[PDB]
Amino acid sequence: GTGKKEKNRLLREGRTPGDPHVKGENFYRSAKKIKTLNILKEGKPIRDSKGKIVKAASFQSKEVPKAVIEPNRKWFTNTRVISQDTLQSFREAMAEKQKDPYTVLLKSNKLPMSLIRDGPKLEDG
Amino acid sequence: ETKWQAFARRRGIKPKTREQRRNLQYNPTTGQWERKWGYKGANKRGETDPIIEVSAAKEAMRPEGTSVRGDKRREIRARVKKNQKQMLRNQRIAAEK
Amino acid sequence: RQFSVLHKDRKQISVGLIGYPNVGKSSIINALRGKAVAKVAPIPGETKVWQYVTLMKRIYLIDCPGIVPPNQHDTPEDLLLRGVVRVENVEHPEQYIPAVLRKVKQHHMERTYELRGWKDHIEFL
Amino acid sequence: PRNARSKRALEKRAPKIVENPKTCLFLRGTTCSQITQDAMNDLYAMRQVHAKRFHKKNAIHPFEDATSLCFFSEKNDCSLMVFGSSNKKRPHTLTFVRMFDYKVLDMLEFYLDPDTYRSISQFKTSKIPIGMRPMMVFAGTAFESPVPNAFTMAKSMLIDFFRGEPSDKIDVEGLRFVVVVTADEPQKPILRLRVYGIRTKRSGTRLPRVEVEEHGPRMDFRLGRMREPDPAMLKEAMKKAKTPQEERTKKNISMDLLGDKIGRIHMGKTDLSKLQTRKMKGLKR
Amino acid sequence: MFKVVKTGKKTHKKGWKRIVTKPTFVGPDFTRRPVKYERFIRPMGLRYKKANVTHPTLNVTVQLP
RNA sequence: GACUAAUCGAACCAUCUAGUAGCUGGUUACCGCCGAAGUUUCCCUCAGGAUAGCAGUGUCGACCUUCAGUUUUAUGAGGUAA
RNA sequence: AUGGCCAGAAAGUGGUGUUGACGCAAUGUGAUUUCUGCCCAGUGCUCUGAAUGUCAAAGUGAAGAAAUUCAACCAAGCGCGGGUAAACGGCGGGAGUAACUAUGACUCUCUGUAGCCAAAUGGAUUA
RNA sequence: AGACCCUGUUGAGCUUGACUCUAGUUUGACAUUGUGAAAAGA
RNA sequence: GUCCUAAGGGGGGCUCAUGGAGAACAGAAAUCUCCAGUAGAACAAAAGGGUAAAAGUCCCCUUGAUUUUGAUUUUCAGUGUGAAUACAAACCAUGAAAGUGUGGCCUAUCGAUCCUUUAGUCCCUCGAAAUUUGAGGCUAGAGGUGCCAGAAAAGUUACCACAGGGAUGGCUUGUGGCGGCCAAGCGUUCAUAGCGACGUCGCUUUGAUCCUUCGAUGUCGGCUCUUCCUAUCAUACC
């Protein structure tokens, strides 16, 4: 055959030479799977001979960042707008809505439901 | 597909988000917002600074006539030349394809 | 499988089993798996904590302990006949015999226990 | 492209999913009759907005070599061409050239009848506004050939000439002019091009009564030489792209009237005939 | 921001899970990840959907989604 | 991963062998004269280095030249009070 | 049986073996009762079926004065191309067609108060 | 001087397309290797 | 080595290179005036027909340096409020307006004391001598990760072992946060701003409903028994 070494395996699979690799890749392990399994092994800091943390664990940095918001014209504009024709169409849509047990909801549509849902009954109000 | 695109696809390198790649950063020491590159960018920091300390070894190794005020422009020009060389190689390979 | 196809964008679908105690949730998980992977007992409250079972590569089953929603119209007799409680830990179990005799036809009781001719539950017992 | 203006020009000339309206280049040869020039003027008047006009003499014979035509298409970004020529054999010739990817897709010759030609100025009627599209009527049995021939090619070429700009909506006031091309199968059949203005009258019903009045020009053609497309180039040109606003239909995935994504499940028929109930002691007689 | 959630039955615990200790907004149609692949834990009791929003010009405070 | 002479995730005996440890512990009279130090500058970091600076014994050279964590004078910065 | 499974540094060496498929050796499951979700063909299992595509040593040819260099040829295995323990694995169905073989692809639409059928019983709620 | 935590130029047992090797197995060539034929080449 | 409120977009005004005739210094060549000037200038590209009340050149406005939304396109997603991307729409800029226009361009990295490669005739040595190949040394050149080589030495131990090192505080208690207003007073009265208790106003079921319980990293107990505090449940008094 060709060989069971990782060099021969990469030559057989036609990897571009010179690419970096993540430590632990083999026939059964790709880079994504290695990352997924190393997540389970994360969580321990690096300590010196006296136990003082010299490198913090994952997402435990203890470094205080600069929490600043830049000036931007996008903060003062309308993110979502809707027209009256579209509102009337959606009101007619809820007017003609029926319930079907064999249909499931997969992704809700972000809508201003307070302007589309019909009002409460007059006795309740 | 260019060389970077093929390398990123093989290595699982994800594209940077539009917020991440913005030309804006917050300078702590001045307490102001500044650009990373371009006109008055942070990559040319200190070229208009009135006072620049220079090391004696680098000043002695510096050629005559050149000043410290153009070192960052020299580095930027070298990086731009390398990037454009890679772009032209990618364009030539795509033209052959 | 149809639900998994509708949610093919995710890595999995998770199916949680809910209901009253002793309705057969763990038995349904074991039957779908084809193997005794969840504990099954005729005593209510066999499953005490939630449990993950891998059915297929993209399907998970979640076993849950049995719940009884509190209702002010529910009686201890109704709960005991629905199977909430263990009859070993109840006081005076003979008071629930007339409810059983009302629920079960008389000839079914007679044919089950090979005994006939009682006028009330005390004489039957 | 250094300047943003040159970048805009290159982006406009770049291939797109939704193509721009086609541009027609009007040009003439070394010799060209006055009747042919008048016909080119009438066609340019009908297609002013999306046309460019040359004014010199070009030493081009299109059915011998079309490298100059390809170069002109490359430079002017013109995908249709009207080429004028005169000759002893062919006194009044309009050569319709259709391009694809700056190369000649197909060509057709029209021979104009000089005695029956009438220009737009010879009719004293109200004319078509600049930029407004006319509607089209193709009449006769010559356009229904099962094999692709010169008449089907001429029908396609005249449709591409008089398309204008596509639009999803049109005002009812933009339906006042009609271009009619008439041709019958058979000695050579005559392809007759006429333009009419449309008037409407009461008829006592909901629909109006349409009456026509001639607008000009009055053109009579005999179909001449024909250069057909290569099959591979024709297939690539007749490929249709799909816009991003055309959703790819997924199985059991739909959009409701509120915009929610809805999935459909299929339970199947419940067949409990193969189920044996538990043979309990109280059910055994 | 995060605290370490310890897992395992040994005296030495695995510490890869992180719990979010501040209020969060999880959005509509939210389904939690499986516990084997849930690194960041956003607890249900800290999830919010509405806010008391004040308009500086109209001088009105309204509860809004 | 049980047992294999109270010895078992590899028995006991002798030897190589005074094996190796950067880790732990210890390291033996007196008096006299001096006597300290913690990014200064460079190098990929931690499981990193040199190096400046501070010291002691000797000497040698005309131990010659004088210099000084100080003030004043002239001139800068601070024109800031007034 | 000029075999399999082993052992030994080797041996004119040893065991199984005073053995021969109702046997030997290696696995998995673990009395009886119940019992094999549906359908394949990606990993794998095995096919001397055509290839020289890769192709070691030895051998062959050419050039050089020789050291040497260059060429073909090139076993097994790999590769290519076939059938599966279809074990692992994947697997929402059912119809069509214009593709025409793999992969298709493009449309359509899917929701008995104790019976019947099975060689007394319908069971794992197993003594 | 247990246990638990932390550190090591840490030790050892174990696993796997981790690296370098290797027992076994498999394939080719050379020698052991002799006597005649029939064809195909050079 | 210097300089710039960046480029871009929109709108408006003007016409260029050159030649002739003229004007103190000024004289081929400074500046200004007129006339003639199809662009022979400038800006882009590589016309065989680019642009003239402009696509050239000066003013005015924006300079906000890469907007928002999408059930849609493509790719991806063990961090699935999806991201990147394409398209569309909205917004935005400018203009009286018709309109015009923007909301980026790219790219693996690592050596240069490195890698590859060339020449030496009159360079040196091959140590018994010479010649021809060859090899080494030394010197001098050339190019730069397409044609300049290369860059793949993992885990586990709850079966264990050894050398060591370890094991906020005169805090807390009974009365929410954000936003606005009022406000005695403090300041200020060459500026009339700024602080500000007491309060107040907005958000957070006609005695209903019982068909909405929203995540253990942090661990407590029980027995026996003694004492103390008061922030008092009972008993005593008010």
Ligand SMILES: Nc1nc2c(ncn2[C@@H]2O[C@H](COP(=O)(O)OP(=O)(O)OP(=O)(O)O)[C@@H](O)[C@H]2O)c(=O)[nH]1
């Ligand atoms: N006859 C019959 N009995 C069933 C069936 N399914 C379940 N059972 C019985 O019902 C009992 C309850 O089964 P479980 O799986 O424990 O149900 P559960 O609701 O999960 O019980 P808990 O774990 O206590 O909540 C079991 O002992 C079964 O014997 C069924 O389909 N038919």
Ligand SMILES: [Mg+2]
């Ligand atoms: Mg259960």
Ligand SMILES: [Mg+2]
């Ligand atoms: Mg139960």
